Amino acid sequence: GTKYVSKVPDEHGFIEWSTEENLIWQELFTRQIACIKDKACDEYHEGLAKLNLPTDRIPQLDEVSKVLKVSTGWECYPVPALIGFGEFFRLLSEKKFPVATFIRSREEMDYLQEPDIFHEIFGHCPLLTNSSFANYTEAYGKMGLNATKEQRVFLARLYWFTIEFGLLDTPKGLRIYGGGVLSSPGETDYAMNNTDVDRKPFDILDVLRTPYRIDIMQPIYYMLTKVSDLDEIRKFEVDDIMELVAQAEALGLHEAKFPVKKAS
């Protein structure tokens, strides 16, 4: 693998990216924009218009935050390369999106497990300019603040099937809003085109009961009809979310798909 470390912003929040690091961003950006023109959802494209990201260099977090602040009151928040659940929920609940300030190696161009700066800024930040998606993400952070270990595992699952791997069943066809898909050519092609994979209508109980593995091709995706469908879960009180978590736990998980059974 590779062990990455956040670059430390100077006293102004400035990070000195190298010409090599900018070239890696440029390659990732130009391969992906091409991948998603007719695959990312309309809401995500509108978010790219609002961010107006540089195509040829890694943006300073302040340039992204300026836009997030205008649009939904959010900001990018520089963190170390690994943070715990506690910190993650807390920052989201304060409308601070954690961003580790490193970019992948050349060797790991096609895939890495760690979320790097291209994954966070290209994959997730465009939708944080969308009120529905940003307010949902804020509500998600709140959900986790007083969650037990067991509750946090159900919450991570809701996150996985929405913010990371969410799809839409739109009037113009299947589209993508999950950032895990958006930032990856391999994930985009599989989510859009794989013949046999299960794409199911979103149902919060079904989602909370779905086991998943992070290092396999996903055998199940859930589809909203539009990003604003997240308003329904946004609107639940935390107590309502925990009742749904208690329902999932009491029922136990759905039987795992075969690839999930198999994963180490």
45 assigned ligand-binding residue = no
Identity of the residue, 11 or 107, whose beta carbon is nearer to a second copy in the bound complex: 107
Integer angstrom CA distances of residue 227 from 47, 236, 262: 12, 16, 32
Residues 200-239, one symbol each (x = binds a second copy by CB under 8 A, - = not), give ---------------xxx----------------------
Exactly one of 11, 16, 196, 239 binds a second copy (CB under 8 A); that residue is 196
Q: Give the integer Cα–Cα distance in Å for 24 and 128.
A: 24
**164 annotated to bind ligand:** yes
- The count of chain residues that interact with a second copy, using the rule CB under 8 A, is 19
Least Å distance, CB 117 to a second copy, is 19
146: three-class secondary structure by DSSP: coil
Largest CA distance in the chain: 53
User: Structure tokens of 84?
Assistant: 């715990």
Distances 50 to 31, 124, 224, 256 between C-alpha atoms, Å: 20, 13, 23, 40
Of a second copy, Fe ion, none, which one sits near residue 113, judging by CB under 5 to 8 A according to partner kind?
A: a second copy
CB of 165 to a second copy, least distance (A): 13
Residues near 29 by beta carbon (within 8 Å), at least 6 away in sequence:
53, 55, 56, 118, 122
In angstroms, the CA 115 to CA 64 distance is: 17
254 marked among binding-site residues: no
Query: Residue 179 binds which one of a second copy, Fe ion, none, with CB within 5 to 8 A depending on kind?
Result: Fe ion
Contact region with a second copy (CB under 8 A), list: 45-53, 141-149, 187-195, 234-242:
187-195
Q: How far is the CB of 19 from Fe ion (least distance, A)?
A: 27
186 touches a second copy (CB under 8 A): yes
Token duo for residue 236: 């639940």
Q: Which of residues 19-78 bind a second copy (CB under 8 A)?
A: none
For Fe ion, which residue of 179, 188, 212, 230 counts as binding (CB under 5 A)? 179
Question: What's the min distance (Å) between Cβ of 111 and a second copy?
Answer: 4
**Interface residues for Fe ion in 7-46 (CB under 5 A)?**
none
Q: Should residue 126 be labelled a site residue for Fe ion when binding is judged by CB under 5 A? A: no
How far apart CA 153 and CA 68 sit, in angstroms, is 28
d(CA 206, CA 189): 25
Evaluate whether 9 touches 61 at the Cβ level (below 8 Å): yes
Give the span between the Cα atoms of 140 and 162, in whole angstroms.
Answer: 11
Q: Nearer to Fe ion by C-beta: 176 or 242?
A: 176
- 261 touches, from Fe ion, a second copy, none (C-beta below 5 to 8 Å by class): a second copy
CA angle 197, 199, 205 (to 5 degrees): 125
Chain residues binding Fe ion by CB under 5 A are 115, 179
Query: Annotated binding site, which residues?
Result: 119, 124, 164
Chain residues binding a second copy by CB under 8 A are 1, 110-111, 113, 186, 190, 193-196, 215-217, 258-259, 261-264
